[PDB]
Swiss-Prot record, chain A:
Species annotation: Homo sapiens (Human)
Protein function: Single-stranded DNA-dependent ATP-dependent helicase that plays a key role in DNA non-homologous end joining (NHEJ) by recruiting DNA-PK to DNA. Required for double-strand break repair and V(D)J recombination. Also has a role in chromosome translocation. Has a role in chromosome translocation. The DNA helicase II complex binds preferentially to fork-like ends of double-stranded DNA in a cell cycle-dependent manner. It works in the 3'-5' direction.
Gene name per UniProt: XRCC6
Name under which the protein is recorded: X-ray repair cross-complementing protein 6
Residues of the full protein shown: 32 to 538 of 609
GO MF assignments: 5'-deoxyribose-5-phosphate lyase activity; ATP binding; ATP hydrolysis activity; ATP-dependent activity, acting on DNA; cyclin binding; damaged DNA binding; DNA binding; DNA helicase activity
Post-translational modification (record): Phosphorylation by PRKDC may enhance helicase activity. Phosphorylation of Ser-20 does not affect DNA repair.
Linked residues for Glycyl lysine isopeptide (Lys-Gly) (interchain with G-Cter in SUMO2): K251, K281
Curated annotation (Swiss-Prot), chain B:
Domain notes: The EEXXXDDL motif is required for the interaction with catalytic subunit PRKDC and its recruitment to sites of DNA damage.
Mod. after translation: ADP-ribosylated by PARP3.
Localisation per UniProt entry: Nucleus; Nucleus, Nucleolus; Chromosome
Protein name (database record): X-ray repair cross-complementing protein 5
From Swiss-Prot, chain C:
Function field: Serine/threonine-protein kinase that acts as a molecular sensor for DNA damage. Involved in DNA non-homologous end joining (NHEJ) required for double-strand break (DSB) repair and V(D)J recombination. Must be bound to DNA to express its catalytic properties. Promotes processing of hairpin DNA structures in V(D)J recombination by activation of the hairpin endonuclease artemis (DCLRE1C). Recruited by XRCC5 and XRCC6 to DNA ends and is required to (1) protect and align broken ends of DNA, thereby preventing their degradation, (2) and sequester the DSB for repair by NHEJ.
Quaternary context: DNA-PK is a heterotrimer of PRKDC and the Ku dimer (composed of XRCC6/Ku70 and XRCC5/Ku86). Formation of this complex may be promoted by interaction with ILF3. Component of the core long-range non-homologous end joining (NHEJ) complex (also named DNA-PK complex) composed of PRKDC, LIG4, XRCC4, XRCC6/Ku70, XRCC5/Ku86 and NHEJ1/XLF. Additional component of the NHEJ complex includes PAXX. Following autophosphorylation, PRKDC dissociates from DNA. Interacts with DNA-PKcs-interacting protein (KIP) with the region upstream the kinase domain.
Disease: Immunodeficiency 26 with or without neurologic abnormalities: A form of severe combined immunodeficiency characterized by reduced or absent T and B cells, recurrent candidiasis, and lower respiratory tract infections. Some patients show dysmorphic features, severe growth failure, microcephaly, seizures, and impaired neurological functions.
Entire protein: shown range: 10 to 122 of 4128
Species of origin: Homo sapiens
Annotated protein name in UniProt: DNA-dependent protein kinase catalytic subunit
UniProt family annotation: Belongs to the PI3/PI4-kinase family.
Name of the gene encoding the protein in the UniProt record: PRKDC
Amino acid sequence: YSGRDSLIFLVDASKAMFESQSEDELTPFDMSIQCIQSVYISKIISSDRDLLAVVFYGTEKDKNSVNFKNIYVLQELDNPGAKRILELDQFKGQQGQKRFQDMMGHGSDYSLSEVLWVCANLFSDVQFKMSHKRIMLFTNEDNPHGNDSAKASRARTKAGDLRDTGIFLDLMHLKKPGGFDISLFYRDIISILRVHFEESSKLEDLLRKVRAKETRKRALSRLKLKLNKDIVISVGIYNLVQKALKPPPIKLYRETNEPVKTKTRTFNTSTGGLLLPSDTKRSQIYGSRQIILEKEETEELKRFDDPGLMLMGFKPLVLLKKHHYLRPSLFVYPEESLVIGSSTLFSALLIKCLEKEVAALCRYTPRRNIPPYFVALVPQEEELDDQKIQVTPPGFQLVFLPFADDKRKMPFTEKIMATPEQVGKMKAIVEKLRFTYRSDSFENPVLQQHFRNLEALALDLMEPEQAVDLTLPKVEAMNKRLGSLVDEFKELVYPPDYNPEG
Amino acid sequence: IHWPCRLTIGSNLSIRIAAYKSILQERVKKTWTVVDAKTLKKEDIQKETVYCLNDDDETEV
Amino acid sequence: CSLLRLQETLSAADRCGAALAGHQLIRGLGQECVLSSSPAVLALQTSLVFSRDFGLLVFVRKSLNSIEFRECREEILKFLCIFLEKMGQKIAPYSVEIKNTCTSVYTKDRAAK
DNA sequence: CTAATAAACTAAAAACTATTATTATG
DNA sequence: AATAATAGTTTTTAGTTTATTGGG
């Protein structure tokens, strides 16, 4: 396990946040408003476990423990609930910022030392293992505290000490008809050119709601590969891919929203009283006899080998069939806790099986109560991207092998050739329809619709966000890039009067 | 059992198919029927699910 | 007395469901644990009546899986267990009433937790 | 002259951190 | 007067429910 992420949000309450070079573009206040709403939704979808806070300065009315004037905190470090979303959407919109100005202050002097103090205290209040210290300001001018040299000096001293304590502040470029220049009051008070007249600080992705979910460095299972009977290797087995789905129905009372205790009970038909575990026998009536058995030996038949791996041998990869595929491939990483020195061994065996292209066929048992299956181990090497960041981890891609009874029969099919002109026709078709693959561009539109529906009903929207069905081809460009190829291939193969159906 | 269907090519081509599952992990044909231990009968084994509020002495729902 | 005034302060502080409430409640519970553990016979009866009142109060009021009530409830349970270690049969009036109170403690949210 | 079959549906068991009584010493 | 199993969180998951075809 590793610590959490602390995301600190802090916007100015002044006229600069409420104004634009073109008021059609949403003012810095409201722009920060959709940013925080979007990141809240993204965190809810992805990492709805860390803590998020909202605080203001510049507002002439303040509310904080330190009683720093013009420093008003709104929400403590909190997981974003629908309450926070709705209480921030009221001020969302150019009309909402007027409501803000009315019921909330806007425009007054303040010191960066004050906000640094209050945010340091708020971070001091948390009681969780922590890894990320992220503070995201919201302002469209660097000078206002460089104007007061003493204020600038004490603010930068406080910020430097905080970043020594790991408190990591990120600058947000914000639109300003006068500019939001850097290297004037910035690049010397932020830990990490253009006057940043625009507001480009990856705000596009901050508005890009993410429909993703993954756990925080969670170990799946660590096993110990016995070589023959005594020499054992500690291995970490993990996945870079794992099926995701909508959260299961969280049962709750229709009159209290309280999860009703769902307790099941088998009971005697003779009496109605509860059936003890002794009262129940396992039965499978084969033929005319009812074979009576129990659970312990049932799982002792389900289980056959210890949690671990039993090596079978080495074999060139050519000895596997492409249609042979039992269950989706996993990754294996060296583990140096139960068996130390297996990293040198892992590197040696990795290189050696790379040389001879010999896969490691192995009898594999993940845990108890599970049969030992047979798995193919292929060296999955480290692949470095442009920035030399490993996009493919070094280790073994573990591939799983079915059994004889685990393969259904295929009725004999005719292999009737096609003329080379037809082959070239579809070659042209596919070359027109050619593109690259990337799994981050593919999703389940049903799942995306589920997510958007759940949000918009929790967001109380009049209409759900519409999932994009990327699992359907674009018929316009389709027929554009086919043209006469389709019916040409038809007349080459199919009779014009005979459709493939009927 | 095959999959009698039609693969479709965009909006101007479609051909019928008879799909087959070559690799298909075999399952258990019969589950362990929970019979009685006194009469060896599922019929003596009757079960129910009781939705009752987890508080207030398990208020029935 | 001191037992009564702490009973009132903890009867107040649980007005809000929050971490500070649980902190104060469990701190006062520890204070009374080390206080009334002293062998008394005059403050013992005062402790008896305040314990009855506030045990009913926490059973019907804390009564929640929220840790600001759960930790205080379990501290109360530990303190009363170590208290029955030394009280004799003085529970004779409290016997059946607290038996019912405790089994209802279980059948309520404590079953859920 | 009725019939498998994934699929979504539960359970359901196991691995994943993760503190926390516990002698040994006095 | 100290250390050491140790239950409390996620993660699939094998049976279960729907029905939908495929016969009969």
